[PDB]
Design a protein around this motif. Structure first.
Motif, PDB file in Angstrom:
ATOM      1  N   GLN A 233       0.838  -1.188   0.000  1.00  0.00           N
ATOM      2  CA  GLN A 233       0.000   0.000   0.000  1.00  0.00           C
ATOM      3  C   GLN A 233       0.878   1.244   0.000  1.00  0.00           C
ATOM      4  O   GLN A 233       2.035   1.216   0.425  1.00  0.00           O
ATOM      5  CB  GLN A 233      -0.949   0.029   1.209  1.00  0.00           C
ATOM      6  CG  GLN A 233      -1.472  -1.335   1.629  1.00  0.00           C
ATOM      7  CD  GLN A 233      -0.577  -2.014   2.646  1.00  0.00           C
ATOM      8  OE1 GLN A 233      -0.213  -1.424   3.663  1.00  0.00           O
ATOM      9  NE2 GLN A 233      -0.211  -3.262   2.373  1.00  0.00           N
ATOM     10  N   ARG A 234       0.305   2.347  -0.487  1.00  0.00           N
ATOM     11  CA  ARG A 234       1.045   3.600  -0.580  1.00  0.00           C
ATOM     12  C   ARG A 234       1.347   4.208   0.782  1.00  0.00           C
ATOM     13  O   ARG A 234       2.220   5.078   0.876  1.00  0.00           O
ATOM     14  CB  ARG A 234       0.265   4.609  -1.427  1.00  0.00           C
ATOM     15  CG  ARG A 234       0.044   4.186  -2.870  1.00  0.00           C
ATOM     16  CD  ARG A 234       1.327   4.288  -3.680  1.00  0.00           C
ATOM     17  NE  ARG A 234       1.305   3.419  -4.850  1.00  0.00           N
ATOM     18  CZ  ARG A 234       1.421   3.843  -6.100  1.00  0.00           C
ATOM     19  NH1 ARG A 234       1.569   5.127  -6.384  1.00  0.00           N
ATOM     20  NH2 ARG A 234       1.387   2.958  -7.092  1.00  0.00           N
ATOM     21  N   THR A 235       0.654   3.775   1.835  1.00  0.00           N
ATOM     22  CA  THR A 235       0.815   4.380   3.155  1.00  0.00           C
ATOM     23  C   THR A 235       1.861   3.649   3.993  1.00  0.00           C
ATOM     24  O   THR A 235       2.854   4.249   4.418  1.00  0.00           O
ATOM     25  CB  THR A 235      -0.532   4.403   3.888  1.00  0.00           C
ATOM     26  OG1 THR A 235      -0.762   3.131   4.506  1.00  0.00           O
ATOM     27  CG2 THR A 235      -1.661   4.699   2.915  1.00  0.00           C
TER      28      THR A 235
ATOM     29  N   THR B  15       3.900   0.985   3.157  1.00  0.00           N
ATOM     30  CA  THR B  15       5.137   0.710   2.445  1.00  0.00           C
ATOM     31  C   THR B  15       5.729   1.994   1.871  1.00  0.00           C
ATOM     32  O   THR B  15       5.071   3.035   1.786  1.00  0.00           O
ATOM     33  CB  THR B  15       4.902  -0.308   1.328  1.00  0.00           C
ATOM     34  OG1 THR B  15       4.521   0.376   0.129  1.00  0.00           O
ATOM     35  CG2 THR B  15       3.804  -1.284   1.725  1.00  0.00           C
TER      36      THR B  15
ATOM     37  N   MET C  98       7.401   2.648  -3.596  1.00  0.00           N
ATOM     38  CA  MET C  98       6.661   1.748  -4.464  1.00  0.00           C
ATOM     39  C   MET C  98       7.003   2.007  -5.929  1.00  0.00           C
ATOM     40  O   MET C  98       7.451   3.092  -6.310  1.00  0.00           O
ATOM     41  CB  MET C  98       5.156   1.900  -4.242  1.00  0.00           C
ATOM     42  CG  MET C  98       4.729   1.725  -2.797  1.00  0.00           C
ATOM     43  SD  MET C  98       3.785   0.215  -2.527  1.00  0.00           S
ATOM     44  CE  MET C  98       2.232   0.632  -3.313  1.00  0.00           C
TER      45      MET C  98
ATOM     46  N   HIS D  90       6.284   2.434 -10.055  1.00  0.00           N
ATOM     47  CA  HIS D  90       5.343   3.262 -10.800  1.00  0.00           C
ATOM     48  C   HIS D  90       4.208   2.451 -11.408  1.00  0.00           C
ATOM     49  O   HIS D  90       3.187   3.031 -11.791  1.00  0.00           O
ATOM     50  CB  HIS D  90       6.078   4.032 -11.898  1.00  0.00           C
ATOM     51  CG  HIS D  90       6.491   5.413 -11.495  1.00  0.00           C
ATOM     52  ND1 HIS D  90       5.581   6.414 -11.231  1.00  0.00           N
ATOM     53  CD2 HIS D  90       7.715   5.959 -11.309  1.00  0.00           C
ATOM     54  CE1 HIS D  90       6.227   7.517 -10.900  1.00  0.00           C
ATOM     55  NE2 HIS D  90       7.524   7.268 -10.940  1.00  0.00           N
TER      56      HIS D  90
ATOM     57  N   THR E   1       1.015  -0.289 -11.741  1.00  0.00           N
ATOM     58  CA  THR E   1      -0.215  -0.470 -10.989  1.00  0.00           C
ATOM     59  C   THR E   1      -0.139  -1.726 -10.124  1.00  0.00           C
ATOM     60  O   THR E   1       0.633  -2.652 -10.387  1.00  0.00           O
ATOM     61  CB  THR E   1      -1.416  -0.551 -11.930  1.00  0.00           C
ATOM     62  OG1 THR E   1      -2.624  -0.600 -11.161  1.00  0.00           O
ATOM     63  CG2 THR E   1      -1.328  -1.790 -12.807  1.00  0.00           C
ATOM     64  N   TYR E   2      -0.956  -1.744  -9.072  1.00  0.00           N
ATOM     65  CA  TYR E   2      -0.991  -2.856  -8.133  1.00  0.00           C
ATOM     66  C   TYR E   2      -2.373  -3.474  -7.973  1.00  0.00           C
ATOM     67  O   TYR E   2      -2.529  -4.394  -7.162  1.00  0.00           O
ATOM     68  CB  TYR E   2      -0.483  -2.407  -6.755  1.00  0.00           C
ATOM     69  CG  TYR E   2       1.003  -2.133  -6.696  1.00  0.00           C
ATOM     70  CD1 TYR E   2       1.520  -0.911  -7.105  1.00  0.00           C
ATOM     71  CD2 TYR E   2       1.887  -3.092  -6.223  1.00  0.00           C
ATOM     72  CE1 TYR E   2       2.876  -0.654  -7.049  1.00  0.00           C
ATOM     73  CE2 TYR E   2       3.244  -2.845  -6.163  1.00  0.00           C
ATOM     74  CZ  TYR E   2       3.733  -1.625  -6.577  1.00  0.00           C
ATOM     75  OH  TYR E   2       5.084  -1.376  -6.519  1.00  0.00           O
TER      76      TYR E   2
ATOM     77  N   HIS F   3       6.039   3.368   8.761  1.00  0.00           N
ATOM     78  CA  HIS F   3       6.773   2.998   7.549  1.00  0.00           C
ATOM     79  C   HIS F   3       7.870   1.978   7.867  1.00  0.00           C
ATOM     80  O   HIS F   3       9.065   2.227   7.695  1.00  0.00           O
ATOM     81  CB  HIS F   3       7.349   4.237   6.856  1.00  0.00           C
ATOM     82  CG  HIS F   3       6.366   4.952   5.983  1.00  0.00           C
ATOM     83  ND1 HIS F   3       5.631   6.033   6.420  1.00  0.00           N
ATOM     84  CD2 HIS F   3       5.994   4.740   4.698  1.00  0.00           C
ATOM     85  CE1 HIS F   3       4.850   6.456   5.442  1.00  0.00           C
ATOM     86  NE2 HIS F   3       5.052   5.688   4.385  1.00  0.00           N
TER      87      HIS F   3
ATOM     88  N   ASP G 203       8.808  -1.353  -0.457  1.00  0.00           N
ATOM     89  CA  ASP G 203       8.403  -2.191  -1.577  1.00  0.00           C
ATOM     90  C   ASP G 203       9.614  -2.833  -2.242  1.00  0.00           C
ATOM     91  O   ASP G 203      10.663  -2.204  -2.406  1.00  0.00           O
ATOM     92  CB  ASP G 203       7.620  -1.367  -2.598  1.00  0.00           C
ATOM     93  CG  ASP G 203       7.116  -2.204  -3.758  1.00  0.00           C
ATOM     94  OD1 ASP G 203       7.860  -2.361  -4.748  1.00  0.00           O
ATOM     95  OD2 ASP G 203       5.974  -2.704  -3.679  1.00  0.00           O
TER      96      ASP G 203
END
Ligand SMILES: [Zn+2]
Ligand SMILES: [Zn+2]
Ligand SMILES: [Zn+2]
Lengths: 270, 111, 104, 71, 46, 66
Positions: free
Chosen positions: C19-21, C23, C26, C28, C30-31, C63, C67
């Motif tokens: 997740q962007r929060t 981890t 990340m 570029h 898509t996940y 954090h 990733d």
């Protein structure tokens, strides 16, 4: 005997092949007719395939291509609208035909999947389209895939109108034989030879329908090509006579469209 | 991937027309007509029928590139004869010949 | 091919959807095509640099992980046909994914 | 913010009618939708294409903005 | 929790948890294959 | 792997003649050429479709499925 222009003479008629001789016509018109009959006749064929379950040993693209190459009946293809010209979202009964195929492996031996297993689920509204073409004596059809015990193949297809120019799967004619001037009276070709030309080059089967050339005669420079022998073979979707009629109709439609565009632009510019 | 779409060779797009006539300044009474989305099928027929005419002094066609389905037709006619009239006459003659051929084929197949 | 490495004792990578929060750093790509286990199910069309295997490793506020996913090759695309998951010699996770494409 | 992001869509009209794909990047009015069978990207208006469910179901138009959800 | 896996030896459908190390139950095989997705898969015959 | 549906050169449907060809070759007891002629293939383009075709589908089906 309708008009002093082109004339026809059918040598043989069949459900799959037609043999005829074109007379009082030029080379350009015959070539255009051949090209149109090759890659201009609309036909119904499977375009989009949805694969639900595939436990076989064949890839999804393989089965999709094989299904797209399966011929389908297109007798009433004139009553089906083009997909791009329809007002629906993806497809409907007035512009497409939906076919579903389900196969399972129960017997210990290999279970073959044939084109006769396809079932039409959409409403044809009385149109004679969508039925797979079966010409085998056993009445099985085209072998699509082979399954063993425990393997299942469930998928759904949709058939759409198209022409052979967009894709070769829409072609209604297999091979068209075109020949003229069985003897080299017009000198349109030079025969390669080592010691003799007549002995080395076999005589064509159409040489019996024309008078043999006379030895010691001047070359006729005023003679042009006017007699053509054509043989048309159909895949099975459309009968040969209907194939020829549709080719002539398509050529006429193209010429009429050109004339209409010319007239419209002349009116607009004046 | 740079594969052109298969429908671009027979479908008119946006902003282009089927026919386009531009006057030719090289010779008097000569025009150049550009056809879009057809090639090598009706161009030969049009050229042959124009050559069959007696008031047409020049009739030729060519395809610039096999990539694009288009060809240019150049017609030069005698003084007082518009090339568009010659094109219309050729189209009408082709239509009549095709209709006669279809009728004859249907009559022959009926028996 | 992807593997989990046991750094030290408790600093072990895990296969999960990042997740962007939580981890950091990340990719570029898509996940959304990933699943809960971090592996994409067979039969899903992929293209570009889409992430096929989702792996994260702890750095050592928040954090606590970063990733470490392996994206698909940019110049290649296709459809995943078979996904294999097993264990290596020591006992960690072992994941293999295959992509099938047709070349006309 | 934009609803058309990562949702499977079906291309309507034009030369790709009935095709299935997933929209990846959306900017302004044009939407970049990938293709399943074809390995290419086509940019079309978001309003033209219909919207479907990821698992599968009925298709809806661009009215998802009012609904602010999927399916 | 809802992920479905198929054994590579006896083809037995099974579901496992995160704390559950991957392996089969009807046999001792430790190789599993992910089940096919339930999404929309559409192919063009062209 | 499996017999092609249509001939590559012209486009004749040859995907419905594999079983008939095998049956003719295995009990009718004639050479390949006469069997091909009996099936209905006259051009070598169609003859090569099934004369030089290898059926690898059986080898794939030999493996135990899921
Ligand atoms: Zn429709
Ligand atoms: Zn097992
Ligand atoms: Zn052939």
């Amino acid at each position: 005997m309708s008009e002093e222009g082109p004339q026809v003479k059918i040598r043989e008629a069949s459900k799959d092949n037609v043999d005829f001789i074109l007379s009082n016509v030029d080379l350009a018109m015959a070539n255009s007719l051949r090209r149109v009959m090759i890659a201009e006749i609309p036909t119904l064929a499977i375009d989009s395939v949805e694969v639900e379950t595939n436990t076989t040993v064949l890839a999804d693209e393989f089965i999709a291509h094989r299904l797209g190459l399966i011929p389908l009946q297109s007798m009433d293809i004139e009553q089906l609208e083009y997909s791009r010209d329809c007002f629906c979202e993806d497809h409907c009964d007035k512009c497409s035909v939906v076919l579903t195929l389900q196969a399972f492996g129960e017997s210990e031996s290999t279970t073959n999947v044939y084109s006769k297993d396809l079932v039409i689920v959409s409403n044809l509204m009385g149109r004679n389209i969508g039925h797979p073409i079966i010409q085998d004596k056993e009445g099985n059809g085209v072998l699509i895939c082979k399954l063993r015990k425990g393997q299942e193949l469930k998928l759904t297809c949709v058939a759409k109108k198209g022409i052979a120019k967009e894709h070769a799967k829409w072609g209604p004619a297999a091979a068209i034989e075109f020949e003229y001037d069985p003897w080299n009276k017009l000198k349109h070709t030079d025969y390669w030879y080592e010691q003799d030309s007549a002995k080395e080059w076999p005589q064509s089967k159409n040489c019996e329908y024309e008078d043999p050339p006379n030895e010691g005669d001047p070359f006729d420079y005023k003679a042009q090509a006017d007699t053509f022998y054509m043989n048309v073979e159909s895949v099975g979707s459309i009968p040969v006579d209907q194939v020829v009629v549709r080719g002539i109709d398509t050529l006429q439609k193209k010429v009429a469209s050109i004339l209409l565009a010319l007239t419209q632009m002349d009116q607009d510019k004046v | 991937m740079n594969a052109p779409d298969r429908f671009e060779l027979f479908l008119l797009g946006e902003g282009e027309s089927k026919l386009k006539i531009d006057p030719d300044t090289k010779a008097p009474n000569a025009v150049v007509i550009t056809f879009e989305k057809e090639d090598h099928t009706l161009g030969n027929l049009i050229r042959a029928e124009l050559l069959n005419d007696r008031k047409v002094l020049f009739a030729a066609y060519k395809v610039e590139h096999p990539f694009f389905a288009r060809f240019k037709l150049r017609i030069q006619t005698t003084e007082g004869y518009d090339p568009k009239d010659a094109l219309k006459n050729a189209c009408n003659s082709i239509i009549n010949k095709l209709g006669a051929l279809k009728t004859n084929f249907e009559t022959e197949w009926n028996l | 091919m992807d593997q989990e490495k046991k750094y030290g004792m408790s600093i072990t990578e895990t296969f999960e959807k990042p997740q962007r929060t939580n981890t950091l750093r990340m990719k570029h790509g898509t996940y959304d095509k990933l699943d809960d286990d971090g592996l994409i199910a067979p039969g899903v069309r992929v293209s570009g640099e889409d992430v096929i295997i989702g792996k994260t490793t702890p750095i050592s506020a928040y954090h606590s992980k970063r990733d470490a996913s392996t994206p698909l090759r940019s110049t290649e695309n296709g459809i995943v046909d078979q996904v294999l998951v097993t264990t290596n010699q020591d006992g960690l996770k072992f994941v293999k994914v295959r992509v099938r494409t047709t070349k006309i | 913010r934009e609803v058309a992001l990562g949702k499977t869509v079906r291309i309507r009209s034009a030369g790709y009618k009935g095709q299935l794909g997933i929209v990846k990047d959306v900017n302004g009015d044009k939407a970049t939708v990938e293709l399943h069978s074809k390995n290419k990207h086509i940019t079309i208006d978001k309003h033209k294409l219909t919207y479907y469910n990821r698992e599968g179901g009925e298709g809806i138009t661009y009215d998802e903005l009012v609904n602010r959800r999927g399916r | 929790a809802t992920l479905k896996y198929i054994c590579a030896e006896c083809s037995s459908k099974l579901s496992l948890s995160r704390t559950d190390a991957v392996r089969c139950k009807d046999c001792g095989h430790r190789i599993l294959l992910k089940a096919r997705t339930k999404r929309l898969v559409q192919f063009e015959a062209r | 792997m499996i017999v092609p549906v249509r001939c590559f050169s012209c486009g004749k449907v040859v995907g419905d003649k594999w079983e008939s060809y095998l049956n003719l070759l295995q009990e009718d007891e004639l050479d390949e050429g006469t069997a091909l002629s009996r099936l209905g293939l006259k051009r070598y383009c169609c003859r090569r479709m099934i004369l030089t075709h290898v059926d690898l589908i059986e080898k794939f089906l030999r493996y135990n499925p899921l």
